[PDB]
Amino acid sequence: HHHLANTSAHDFSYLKFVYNATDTSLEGSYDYIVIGGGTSGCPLAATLSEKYKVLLLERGTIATEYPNTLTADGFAYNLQQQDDGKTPVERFVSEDGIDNVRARILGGTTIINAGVYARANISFYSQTGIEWDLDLVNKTYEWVEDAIVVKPNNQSWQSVIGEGFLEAGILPDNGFSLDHEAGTRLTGSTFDNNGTRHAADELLNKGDPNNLLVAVQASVEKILFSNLSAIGVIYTDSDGNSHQAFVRGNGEVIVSAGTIGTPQLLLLSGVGPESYLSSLNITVVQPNPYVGQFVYDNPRNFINILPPNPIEASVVTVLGIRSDYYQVSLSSLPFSTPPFSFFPTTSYPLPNSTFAHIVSQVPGPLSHGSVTLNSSSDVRIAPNIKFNYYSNSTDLANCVSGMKKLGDLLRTKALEPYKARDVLGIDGFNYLGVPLPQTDDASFETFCLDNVASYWHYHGGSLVGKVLDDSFRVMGIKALRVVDASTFPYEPNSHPQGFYLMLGRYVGLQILQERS
Numbered sequence: 001h002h003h004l005a006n007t008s009a010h011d012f013s014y015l016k017f018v019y020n021a022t023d024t025s026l027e028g029s030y031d032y033i034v035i036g037g038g039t040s041g042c043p044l045a046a047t048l049s050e051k052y053k054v055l056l057l058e059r060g061t062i063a064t065e066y067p068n069t070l071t072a073d074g075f076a077y078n079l080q081q082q083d084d085g086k087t088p089v090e091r092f093v094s095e096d097g098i099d100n101v102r103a104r105i106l107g108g109t110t111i112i113n114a115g116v117y118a119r120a121n122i123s124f125y126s127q128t129g130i131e132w133d134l135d136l137v138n139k140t141y142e143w144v145e146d147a148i149v150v151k152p153n154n155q156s157w158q159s160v161i162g163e164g165f166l167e168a169g170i171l172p173d174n175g176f177s178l179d180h181e182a183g184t185r186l187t188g189s190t191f192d193n194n195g196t197r198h199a200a201d202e203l204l205n206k207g208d209p210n211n212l213l214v215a216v217q218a219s220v221e222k223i224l225f226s227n228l229s230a231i232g233v234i235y236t237d238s239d240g241n242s243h244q245a246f247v248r249g250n251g252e253v254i255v256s257a258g259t260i261g262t263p264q265l266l267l268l269s270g271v272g273p274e275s276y277l278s279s280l281n282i283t284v285v286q287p288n289p290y291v292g293q294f295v296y297d298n299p300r301n302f303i304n305i306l307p308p309n310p311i312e313a314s315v316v317t318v319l320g321i322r323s324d325y326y327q328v329s330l331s332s333l334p335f336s337t338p339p340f341s342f343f344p345t346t347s348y349p350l351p352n353s354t355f356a357h358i359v360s361q362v363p364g365p366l367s368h369g370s371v372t373l374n375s376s377s378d379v380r381i382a383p384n385i386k387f388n389y390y391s392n393s394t395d396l397a398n399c400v401s402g403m404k405k406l407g408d409l410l411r412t413k414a415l416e417p418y419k420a421r422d423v424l425g426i427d428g429f430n431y432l433g434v435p436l437p438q439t440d441d442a443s444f445e446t447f448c449l450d451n452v453a454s455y456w457h458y459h460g461g462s463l464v465g466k467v468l469d470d471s472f473r474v475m476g477i478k479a480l481r482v483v484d485a486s487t488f489p490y491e492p493n494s495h496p497q498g499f500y501l502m503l504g505r506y507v508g509l510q511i512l513q514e515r516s
């Protein structure tokens with residue numbers, strides 16, 4: 001941990017090579033075009049710029065425009081803000097009926113997220129069957145962590161929850177560790193100890209400023225194609241005017257537009273299921289039955305306690321990890337207006353005093369759905385997304401196990417001081433919303449199904465093995481890759497930003513190696 005970042009201002013030095021997409025002088029030929037300035041896309045673009053000319057295209061603006069994205073204290077504010085089409089949080093509702101969000105800003109979801117930083121489960125690499133260069137993976141985690149990851153200071157509520165997880169049997173005690181391993185630990189954070197948010201945009205500072213250009217408010221609406229090869233993109237600016245840019249020689253287009261954005265853009269560009277695209281009168285460039293298939297959202301289930309004495313607000317740093325459930329708790333100020341998707345519907349009761357949100361995440365999940373187009377032409381119209389929560393009975397069984405463990409946690413001496421009534425039972429807590437039921441699995445199953453929310457860690461839609469090869473290339477198409485959370489059908493860990501930050505640079509290094 002010698003290499004971890006320290007407290008420091010958010011580093012916006014990279015703004016010297018950030019330009020409005022209205023600037024037609026950005027149009028032309030590049031070695032690489034990266035679509036989506038997010039978690040994977042920023043480190044990918046910075047890495048390729050070490051040697052080659054890169055254009056990074058991001059549909060959102062710069063985070064300085066929304067200062068509440070730059071502090072831990074601003075987390076709920078960004079979700080509370082109405083979506084006017086320009087804000088950093090884009091609201092959506094899955095076809096299941098569960099409210100959700102994605103980012104629309106340079107730095108992507110790292111600019112709006114809950115800051116938790118973890119390295120992938122070390123079993124993940126061999127589970128994928130990809131021939132990873134594991135030494136390089138680790139160097140790459142260190143390259144991310146040196147810029148934006150701290151060892152968190154003590155926070156009273158996170159310490160209470162960690163003592164509770166240990167008492168409840170979530171063993172062993174791993175102390176401070178970046179690694180996804182069974183037991184209870186303090187993990188890293190991308191909020192520093194002064195509350196400053198650090199994010200993927202800062203990895204642009206590691207790019208070569210002579211080689212990297214970033215266009216913001218660049219809405220990429222189509223991949224252009226030629227042996228079938230990607231050659232370029234069409235993007236529009238904030239005034240609505242169109243622009244073109246191309247790759248040259250042995251260069252490549254990489255889509256880093258997220259679980260939602262990547263499949264949407266491939267489908268709009270004619271890459272996807274042949275009879276589906278034909279149904280819409282979209283000319284098929286490359287038939288692939290899996291584009292926008294195998295889309296996953298790990299369920300979040302939770303209870304809320306209202307202690308009779310105020311608790312200190314925290315960011316999540318203490319994790320209770322089992323193979324079948326990953327648990328945390330956030331302590332928060334009350335909410336005067338709903339932070340969209342924090343609770344899964346807009347009619348949920350809001351807390352009027354300090355509260356602990358006590359959470360369990362289902363691994364995998366095994367349930368999957370799809371991204372499909374709403375508009376056959378307009379990339380600014382959100383696609384349809386369905387997750388099919390709890391369609392797979394294993395997911396439901398694992399939520400029941402997680403909920404029973406949350407019962408154990410509420411029964412600890414660690415949590416006893418936060419009860420309203422000093423009675424023997426967990427009914428001595430005051431709850432916001434639905435409490436845990438009791439004994440028989442059926443009451444737990446109903447609880448899991450009825451009270452599900454998004455964990456916000458959705459993934460899939462452009463999977464390795466379905467849409468991509470083991471080098472992240474789109475099968476059948478030259479000079480086209482995908483690097484972002486669309487690429488895997490299971491989580492790398494409880495909190496995947498660390499993995500997708502690493503993956504952007506790692507695939508960049510693989511591209512530069514493959515090319516030399």
Ligand SMILES: Cc1cc2nc3c(=O)[nH]c(=O)nc-3n(C[C@H](O)[C@H](O)[C@H](O)COP(=O)(O)OP(=O)(O)OC[C@H]3O[C@@H](n4cnc5c(N)ncnc54)[C@H](O)[C@@H]3O)c2cc1C
Nearest residue numbers: 036038039059108109113114115116220261485495496497
């Ligand atoms: C509210 C919330 C809290 C979270 N908390 C945590 C946490 O604490 N820890 C953790 O590990 N994970 C957390 N996650 C999950 C994690 O942050 C994400 O899974 C990860 O950041 C996804 O990275 P990505 O590169 O796939 O997508 P993104 O980072 O969203 O990047 C995609 C980018 O592409 C841009 N874009 C999309 N379409 C286009 C287009 N057509 N043209 C141009 N640009 C386009 C988007 O604007 C965006 O900037 C959280 C997620 C959310 C939503």
Ligand SMILES: *[C@@H]1O[C@H](CO)[C@@H](O)[C@H](O)[C@H]1NC(C)=O
Nearest residue numbers: 002003004005006145146147
């Ligand atoms: C953080 O501070 C320590 C000295 O306390 C130093 O050893 C280290 O290099 C600093 N880290 C970074 C990434 O700047």
Ligand SMILES: *[C@@H]1O[C@H](CO)[C@@H](O)[C@H](O)[C@H]1NC(C)=O
Nearest residue numbers: 020022061062216217238239
């Ligand atoms: C780009 O320029 C337009 C005016 O042509 C302006 O309305 C918009 O806010 C600018 N965007 C950024 C990100 O500077």
Ligand SMILES: *[C@@H]1O[C@H](CO)[C@@H](O)[C@H](O)[C@H]1NC(C)=O
Nearest residue numbers: 119122134135137138178179
């Ligand atoms: C990579 O780092 C992890 C800890 O994150 C360590 O357990 C593992 O042994 C390292 N692998 C290699 C090949 O260095």
Ligand SMILES: *[C@@H]1O[C@H](CO)[C@@H](O)[C@H](O)[C@H]1NC(C)=O
Nearest residue numbers: 007008009071193194195196
């Ligand atoms: C902490 O952040 C604030 C901005 O919120 C800044 O005024 C202050 O200088 C920072 N503290 C340290 C110790 O760098």
Ligand SMILES: *[C@@H]1O[C@H](CO)[C@@H](O)[C@H](O)[C@H]1NC(C)=O
Nearest residue numbers: 276277278279280281282376
């Ligand atoms: C596709 O175009 C054909 C005409 O070539 C038309 O008959 C059909 O209705 C169209 N379908 C859609 C969904 O536009």
Ligand SMILES: *[C@@H]1O[C@H](CO)[C@@H](O)[C@H](O)[C@H]1NC(C)=O
Nearest residue numbers: 121123124127181182322323
């Ligand atoms: C680590 O990942 C593997 C799947 O490859 C799984 O067997 C194991 O349960 C995971 N461990 C935890 C603690 O999540």
Ligand SMILES: *[C@@H]1O[C@H](CO)[C@@H](O)[C@H](O)[C@H]1NC(C)=O
Nearest residue numbers: 093372373374375382383384
């Ligand atoms: C587009 O989205 C809305 C929900 O946002 C839905 O009611 C409508 O049916 C969708 N249209 C298409 C063509 O899928």
Ligand SMILES: *[C@@H]1O[C@H](CO)[C@@H](O)[C@H](O)[C@H]1NC(C)=O
Nearest residue numbers: 365366367391392393394395
């Ligand atoms: C649950 O998903 C797994 C995929 O790992 C599959 O083997 C199992 O058959 C699925 N069950 C249902 C009901 O789809």
